[PDB]
Each structure stands twice: as C-alpha cells, then as structure tokens.
Amino acid sequence: ASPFRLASAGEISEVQGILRTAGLLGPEKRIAYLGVLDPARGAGSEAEDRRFRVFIHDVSGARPQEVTVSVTNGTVISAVELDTAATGELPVLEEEFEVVEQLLATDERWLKALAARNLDVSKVRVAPLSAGVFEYAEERGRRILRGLAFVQDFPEDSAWAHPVDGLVAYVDVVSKEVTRVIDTGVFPVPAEHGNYTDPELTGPLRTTQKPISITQPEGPSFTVTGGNHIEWEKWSLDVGFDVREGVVLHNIAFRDGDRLRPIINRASIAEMVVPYGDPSPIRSWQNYFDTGEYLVGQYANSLELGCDCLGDITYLSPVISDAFGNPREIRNGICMHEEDWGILAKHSDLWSGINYTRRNRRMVISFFTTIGNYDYGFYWYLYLDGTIEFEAKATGVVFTSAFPEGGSDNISQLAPGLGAPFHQHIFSARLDMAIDGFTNRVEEEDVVRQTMGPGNERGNAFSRKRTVLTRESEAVREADARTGRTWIISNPESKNRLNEPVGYKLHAHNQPTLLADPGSSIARRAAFATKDLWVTRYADDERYPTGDFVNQHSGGAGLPSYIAQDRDIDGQDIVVWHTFGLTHFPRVEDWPIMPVDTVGFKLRPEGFFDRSPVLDVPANP
Amino acid sequence: ASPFRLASAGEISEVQGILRTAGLLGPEKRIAYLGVLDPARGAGSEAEDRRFRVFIHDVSGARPQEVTVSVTNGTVISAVELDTAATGELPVLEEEFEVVEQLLATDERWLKALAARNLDVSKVRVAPLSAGVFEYAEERGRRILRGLAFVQDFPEDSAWAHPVDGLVAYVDVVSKEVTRVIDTGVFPVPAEHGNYTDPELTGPLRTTQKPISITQPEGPSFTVTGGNHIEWEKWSLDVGFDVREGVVLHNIAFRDGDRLRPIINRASIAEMVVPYGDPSPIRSWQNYFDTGEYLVGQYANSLELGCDCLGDITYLSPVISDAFGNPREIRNGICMHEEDWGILAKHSDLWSGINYTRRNRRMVISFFTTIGNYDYGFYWYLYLDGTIEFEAKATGVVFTSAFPEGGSDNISQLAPGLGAPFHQHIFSARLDMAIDGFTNRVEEEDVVRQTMGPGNERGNAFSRKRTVLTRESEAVREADARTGRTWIISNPESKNRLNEPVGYKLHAHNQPTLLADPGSSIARRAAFATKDLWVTRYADDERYPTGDFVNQHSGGAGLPSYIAQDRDIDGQDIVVWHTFGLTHFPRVEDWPIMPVDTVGFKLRPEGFFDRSPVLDVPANP
Numbered sequence A, B: 001a002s003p004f005r006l007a008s009a010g011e012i013s014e015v016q017g018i019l020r021t022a023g024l025l026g027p028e029k030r031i032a033y034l035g036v037l038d039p040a041r042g043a044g045s046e047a048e049d050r051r052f053r054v055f056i057h058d059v060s061g062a063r064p065q066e067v068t069v070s071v072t073n074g075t076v077i078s079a080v081e082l083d084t085a086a087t088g089e090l091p092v093l094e095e096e097f098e099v100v101e102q103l104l105a106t107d108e109r110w111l112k113a114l115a116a117r118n119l120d121v122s123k124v125r126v127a128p129l130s131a132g133v134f135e136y137a138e139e140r141g142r143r144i145l146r147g148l149a150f151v152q153d154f155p156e157d158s159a160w161a162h163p164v165d166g167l168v169a170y171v172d173v174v175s176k177e178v179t180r181v182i183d184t185g186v187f188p189v190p191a192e193h194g195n196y197t198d199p200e201l202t203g204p205l206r207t208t209q210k211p212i213s214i215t216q217p218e219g220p221s222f223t224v225t226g227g228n229h230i231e232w233e234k235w236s237l238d239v240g241f242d243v244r245e246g247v248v249l250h251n252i253a254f255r256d257g258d259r260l261r262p263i264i265n266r267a268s269i270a271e272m273v274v275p276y277g278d279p280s281p282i283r284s285w286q287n288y289f290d291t292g293e294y295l296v297g298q299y300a301n302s303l304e305l306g307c308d309c310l311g312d313i314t315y316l317s318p319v320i321s322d323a324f325g326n327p328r329e330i331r332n333g334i335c336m337h338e339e340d341w342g343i344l345a346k347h348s349d350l351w352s353g354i355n356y357t358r359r360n361r362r363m364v365i366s367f368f369t370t371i372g373n374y375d376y377g378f379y380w381y382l383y384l385d386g387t388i389e390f391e392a393k394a395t396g397v398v399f400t401s402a403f404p405e406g407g408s409d410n411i412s413q414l415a416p417g418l419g420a421p422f423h424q425h426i427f428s429a430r431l432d433m434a435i436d437g438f439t440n441r442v443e444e445e446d447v448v449r450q451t452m453g454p455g456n457e458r459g460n461a462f463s464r465k466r467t468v469l470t471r472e473s474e475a476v477r478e479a480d481a482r483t484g485r486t487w488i489i490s491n492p493e494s495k496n497r498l499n500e501p502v503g504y505k506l507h508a509h510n511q512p513t514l515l516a517d518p519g520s521s522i523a524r525r526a527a528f529a530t531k532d533l534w535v536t537r538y539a540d541d542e543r544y545p546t547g548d549f550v551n552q553h554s555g556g557a558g559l560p561s562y563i564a565q566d567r568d569i570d571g572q573d574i575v576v577w578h579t580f581g582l583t584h585f586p587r588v589e590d591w592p593i594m595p596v597d598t599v600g601f602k603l604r605p606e607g608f609f610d611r612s613p614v615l616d617v618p619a620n621p
C-alpha cells in the first residue's frame, strides 16, 4: 500500500483507540486537529509506519497536548503538554462557532448595547472571530474569541447586509465568560437586504443561457489507483488531504520516455491570512488565518455535479476526524477532471508547406471551502507541456461594516449605510522541491538592460542574470516586476542533453505583499506575507510559515526562525515558500455576493526537457 | 445598414473601380493596405458614407499615394503623393516575400558566401525581413528588405533548424538590386532537423488522450445580426476586421436593465513589435513590426473546426483586398463561441442556511495569424460579470541563429550548434474609451501604506490614492506592481446610485517594457513600448502608436508627437494605449515548435453597476 494514501476511516478510529487506551482522550478531550504525517525521507524501503498527529483540547481547563501516534503499531510515539501562553492556542473548534453568540445573549452589557439600537437579541448573529494578540494581558494563556454582530431580520436573511458597527465583544471560550464588551458609539444598521435569491432583488432570471454539454464518451484520460494515485498524460502524483491545508499534492513527477522524473515532492497552501485595513478599534484587530487558525480542509464543501464541477468528474471523499475522534467523510470534497485548454502549439510554414495545430489539456484537482462569509476554490492544474499552476478563486460575501457619514479612507460603500473594510487575502504556497530529485538549488533571475556602446553599438542588446541563493540567510527575496524577476529551481547535478542544469521557473503575479506597518502585530505573526519568496532547507517539522499553533500566538514563529538557522541550500533538499495575495478594495459589484476573483502562480519547465515534451501529442480527432 | 458592418466584396470592387476611373490604379499600381474607415463622431444621424483608405505602391518607381475614397458616393475624397523618405515606406507587400531570395540567388557575393559554406543555392531559403533605419544612407527613400538564410535540406524540411549565421544581405525591392552582402565569418549550419511531424523525432504518438466532446444542443446563446453584430448575455458589440490590425471590436456596451450603456468605443491591437536583443551585426537591426510593417490581418489563418476552434463555433469570413483591388475572402478567419468559465459566485451560509452556486461564461472572439516563423492567436473575452479581457497566444517556431562556441549572453541553446536570440513580443492595445458615453477621464490608482501611529495605533490601516491625469503631458505612465498600480477610466458626469462616478479598472500584468537602450533606433521608432500606459485625446487620424507608415520610418512618429499637443483629457473623448509584452529567453522546450505562452490585460467594472450585474443568472440546469 502506498504510504501516501489518504487516511481511511479505520485509521481515524485507530487513533481514537490508541489515545483512549493511552489515557489521552477522556470525555473532557476534544480533537482540534488530526492528520496523517508524511513518510520520512528514505523510508521508501521499507515497511509501513503510518503516523498521525493530533492536537487535543481539554474543555475542563486542563492543558492541551500534542500527540503523535503510530496506527501501524498501535503506540503513542510522543505526547507533550502545551503551554499555550508560550506556543499558542489550539485551532478554533467547530463547536465554538455558536458559543460566542450564546454567551453574549445573556450578558447585560451586550443586551444594553443592543437595546440602545432597538435590536432583538434573538435576531443578532455573532461571528466567532479569531482574537490575535494585542494589548489585553488577561487574554494571555486563555482561549479567546472576539464577536461582531450582524442582524438577521428572519431565518433566511443574509446577516452580512446588517452589520452592527461600534460594538465588539471578547469572550473566554473555556471559562464561558464575557471578558469585555466595547461600545464606542451607535451607527445605523444598514437597512437594505442582501438576499441574492430574492426575486425582488435579482429581478426576473435570465432565459437566454443555452446549455453547454461537456462529456467524455470514452471516459477520462486519467486513472485513479490506490485510492488517490493519479496517472495522466505522463504526470504521476498522489492527492492527499489534510484538515488544515486541504488538498495536498505529493510526488509530482513526469514520465519522460522511460524515466519517472520528480519535480515537486510536496505542494500545499500552508497558510492563508486575511488582514483588515480599517483602523477602527471595532475591527483593527481582525486578521483571519483561514488555514492556520480555522483549518480550511475541515470546511470543504460537498461539490455538486453539473453545478460545482462540470464534465466527467472523478471525486475523492476524504476522511477527517470529528471532535471526538470519529471518522467523518466529506462527500465529494475533491473534484478531479481533465479539460481542453485551447491551442498547445501551432505553425503554418510557407517554406515547408506543412500546417500544424495541436490542442492543450490540463488536469484539474480542486476543492471549495467556506469560512464564515468567505468561500475559496483551491485549484491545481497540470498541463501537457509540463507547466504546473495554482489558482485560488475568491468569492462569497464581503465582510461588512457601517459606512461612515463622512466617508472613509479605509472602507468602500456598497449600499446605503453599508461599508466593506479594505483587506487582503494572502496565501503561502509551500513547495517542497524535487527537481529531478532532491539535490536542488534556487537562482533569482532578473532581466538585464545593456547600455548602447562598444559591443552593443546599436543599443538593442539585453540579457539576464541568475544569482544563486546559497544559504537561508540569503533566501528571503522580494518581487521586481519591472526587471521581470523570476526564481529558477534547478538540479545542479542533473544536466539536459545540452549540458545545462535542468530546472523549473516560478512565474509570480507580483501583487502587493502585506501592507501593514512592519511594527504591527500582524507583520510579526504573518512575517511570511511581507516577502514574496523564501527558501528553506527541508526539515520534517517546518510545515507552516506561521508555526504549528497560530491562534493567539505572539509572533516570530515560523519562517523568520527557520531561516535564522542559515542552512546550506545550494544543492540540497530545499523548500520554496511563495507568498501571493489579492488586495481587495471592495466594489459595488461585490455586493450582495461577489463574483470570483483570482490569484496564483505557475512553474514552467526551463531546460528540464531535451526538447518540447509534447511532440507526441496526436492531431485531434 | 449598420455603418460598422464588415467590408463586403462589392465594396472592395467599388474602391478598385473608383481608383481606376480616377487614374490612380493603373497596371503599375499595387494596393499595400486597404480598409474601411470608422464612421465619424456624431454621424449616427444620419446617412451612410462608407469611406475606404488605401496605400498604393507603384512598381515602376513612381511615388506612392494615400487615397481615401467614398464607396457610397463613388468619389475620391483625398489623394496625396507620399515622400517615403520623410513619412515612411509602405507596408511590406505579400508579393515581395520571394523577391529577396530570387535576387540573391544570382548575386555573385551571395553565391560566394554560400559556396564557402558548401550550401546549394537551390536549398537556401531567405526570410524577407523588415529593414528598419540605421546607418545606410543609400536606403533613405528606397524600399529595402534584409535577408537571413536558412537551409531547407528538402522541400518539407523546417529551415528554421538550419540558420546560416555570419551572413546577411540587403536588397532594393523596386530597382531589383542587391545593395549589400555582409559575410562576417563562417558558422556551422546546425545539423539536426526540427521536423515535428517526423516519427523519428516525435516518437510513437500518444494513444492515451480520450475524447472531449463540447456541444450546445440548442445552439449558442449569442446571436449574429447584420453580418457582424453580436448580442450575448447583455453585451452588445460589432466585430470589425482590418488587414493591418486584425479583429477590431466596436461599440462594446452592456444592457443594464433597459439602458444600453457604452463601455469601450473601439478596441484593437494597434501595434505589435518583436525587438531582438542580440548585438551581433547579423541580427542587431531586426525589429519586426508584425502589425504596422506586415499587416497581421492579411495573414489570418483559416481556422479548422474541431482542431483550431472547438465547440459550437460561429465564423466570420472577412474580406480584404489583394494587391490589385480584387476582394479576397479569408474563409473562417474569425471564430466566435461562448464557453463555460467555472464558478461565477458561490456562498454557503451557515446562518441563513442557503447554499448558492452559479457558473460563469465568457464570449470568445479570436483569430490566428502567421508572420514567417511566428504564429499568434488574438483573443477577446467578454464575461458575464462585465469583465473584458484580451489575451495573445504566442507560438510557432522560434527565430534561430548559430549558438556561438563560447556561449552567449544574448542567445539560448536549443540543439547542438543551434541558438535562439533573446527577444520581446510587445503589443499596444488601443482602447478608445466610452465609459457610459464619451465624457471620460483616467486616474492612476496606487495602494497607500500607512505608518503605525495616531489614528492608526495598531499599524493595520492601508488605503489607496487616485491621481487624475488632466492633460496629455501628464498621461505617460509606467507600471508599479509593488504598489498595486492600476488605471481607472471613469465618467465624471455619470454616477452610480451611491453617488460615485462609474468606472472600469485596467488590470495589467506588469511585464517588462522595451529593454533597448533609450538612444536606440527601436526606442525611437517604438517609443510606445517604453511605457505601460498612454492617454490621448481622441482624434480620427491618431490610429497607431507608431504612425501610419512604420516601415523604414526614422522615428518619433506616433504617440510622442500626439501627446505633445497637451490636450485636455479630464472629462473628454479619450483613448487609452496600453503597452504589454512577453520577454522571451528561449528555452529548450521551445524547440522544434514552441508551446503557447500568453500575455494580456483585463478591465473590470469598478462602481459601473449599482450592485452585482449577475444576480439574474439562473441556477445551472
């Protein structure tokens, strides 16, 4: 059995069993995170050891633990009690979603805030929002959420239309206490609804959209074996799934003639953070680590054929653990299919008389998740020509506020009285590289402009320069779109037939990075977002750019501490961390539900192959 | 009849007739360019005047002329003899393709160059290459082409595989003279072939690609009326076609309820230039103005159903003039269809219980052209949500050279002895804007970072600043990807329901602009390429960023001279010229035929609509 296979339901139950027998999962315990670990380097030969790692919350106030078990051997490998004031709180539990509203409903300061606004407490939804780390010393070591109110005029109303500004509350989830209720002033609660299925607001639905039928009459060109192993148009890989990261891709390789050549050992979105840019004390603390704090895999949608995923779809239904260690299946939580992708290569040659046209295809592996108001589609594409791509599709409902009467430098207007604060959605792709194997390096490549003169008399020449990143202390890089900057991962010990090192070139979109002041809390907690590209030496415990426990962690953790080890990355097992994000100044067209907007990156072969790798593509039927 | 309808065959014949009767098209005359002119501003009401503009070459050495005729009225509106030494030579004629080889075949200096290399003159193909303007005073006023040799080992061989380096020749096309033959040294003629249909090099073709069937069982959702008028999912526009520019889009508008709101009056690629970066005197002169020198519309491919254009395709077969004024149909030279485009908007709301998913579509209008070794697909997309996009798909066979033995700072290696010089492919999109009508302005929008402190105590705030471009002297702008710079075209007299000016935001890719030294010939002839965005006041004779006659024109013409008029562009009929390009350092995978690579831009509504414009999209069948 492939040691990269998906966790099965029986594997989760065995973790539950091992923890129970070990005395680690009594009735007061809640699993906040559970996931299989990747096989260790070199273990390929031989003998399974499927290890699972668990974060265990205790609802009685006892200390939480990090536990690794061996489902293979039925043992506890490690169990450590965590001092959350130092190393962070556990991830948010799904069971804590409703607690913030429930505690506030009977708090007299909250009820007073709502009475001044003539709002019925029974119609006041409270978003359970991650707290971060600011000035409130009582919160250190405590599991806090913060709450912002949204009025639901009726049970199928969109509360996002009716933010209650000037009001925020903090609660201690464990002790079940409201620690602070801040009311800075009354704002009108925007009156319009945002119900995008209401015929009054949609108007009569269009009748003009004729059907588009996409079918594969002989079925798809990719095979799935071993539960999650894909073979498609020379690509080979395994599709993993982790409750924190979502879909992960393992062992991406390309059959080049008779050789299976590795390209990327592990590909994941290791963090995704939404910083807000509104300096109001009602929201100036909000930074939602969708991945590290909430666990995006956990909230993956079940994707409906014909509507969520069109064409000939093959699904995976990954398993996760519920809060008590029982397996739960996410039905149709991963969609897989191949698509047409236009012209691959075309040339009509006058001299030879030959006219040639070939079509491209891509393999698509995706999931869609929902974190409160946000919805994101994570898409990995593999193309016939070797190009690898990632794309995020950001949609959902924008996070709202009041629109101040004097306007705002940090908030857009969507509807009368309704604002939407400025924010970014910033991702980190963790690419554990394996270009032709693990001995890799990274070069930064800039265009070079040349001055007209001797050896360049007509002033037309231009060139490129590549700079090797030799050690981690040199591997924190920024974009330079003006100089066409890219980063090439090569194998300096593997040369193509032209005696040049095989490589792949990372093409970024060069969007703005984290805008927050460098002295801010979020710049410290999300340092990775402040730079476009990081290279580290591989290490099995360096998994997320933000560290293991993001929630209410003071800062510094993660990449800035990994990098300080100043390890050799010049022909070594290395990891590329690419920051990329969307800067979102909301527009009216984003309201009441926003059209998808996208961000991502791609890697293209750069002398990896001896010549084009798609010459064996046949003329289309 | 819509005055934006395509030229018909009868219209071309009537031009021929009018010129013949007027004494302007005797047997020594060759039409180098012919195209309908756009209706003048305000002529909507009323009465046709279909005017055509013609550039007439004279093969006897008499001066060429620029002529505008009225096919409506059967008259010559204007005819002016051109002093090509001042205002430029005419565009390259298709009939001149073979002349460069034919003249050189019997020239003793050329034959000597080839004999030293043991090449059979009968197997030596010569690319007819535009000359530009350099140090050769004898060329001023003369119609010159330059030639580079490529060996074809047999009639169906790819000559690009066998460049003959160290050798270039210049010829006077009219006098039929070889003006110079420069032989700077012998290089090996690369030996490998590049025949991508040869089973020896492709290997056995793949059998793994299962079929993908895309159909529309009730036909497409767009209608074509009046020959070229498209109605699709609230969009309205006309598809034009000009032999120089290719597909042009007129009168792009969006039905918003009961109003037809204009967005863009005219959209075209007004120039496309390929500068080379190899300082060798054999190629340091090459800069191929595919649009302005060669006329891309002229070489549009006939696009084959199922292979070039998949799905339910509606074609236009535009008409052009041959060199004698006879109409010629480009069969299936424009493909039109709609496609699925993934998720449009999705949200799964916990509080309201509603789960919502809608799919996107785009309308696609494209053509594909071949200029020697290059092939380009020009694609215009319209999306349901109002986004407009352009994409170029660059493929074909890379222009080759020898690979020097000591390597090269300006040339990649593709195969033993085979080089491909560095180059860029730089486009200019001419967008004659009409945001809600003609009274428009442009603002440059940058992200603003804020310093932590008073009014921003937690250091999270960020904002934006918009700078109006008031006059043409302020409207030459450059990218700043780091600050998320975009440009917003608004109508300062048309406000959405929130009292904010309607607009569209141009999202560029922020690729490098022209790399050549600012003092170089190409920087002067292609000044537009040196900056990302230009705004001019509309004027009916300001059509191309490079002027009317690009071929062998000394420089300065075009945008830098338009801009100097310093006209008011703050709430006026304006035109946005966006430079965008690909910088191409060829890779081994580009050889022997290159996979498509892409570049483009998009515009997104920015407060143009009162709320999302796709709320009336129905749940998919």
Ligand SMILES: [Cu+2]
Pocket (backbone or CB within 6 Å): A394, A423, A424, A425, A584
């Ligand atoms: Cu957003």
Ligand SMILES: [Cu+2]
Pocket (backbone or CB within 6 Å): B394, B423, B424, B425, B584
């Ligand atoms: Cu190129």
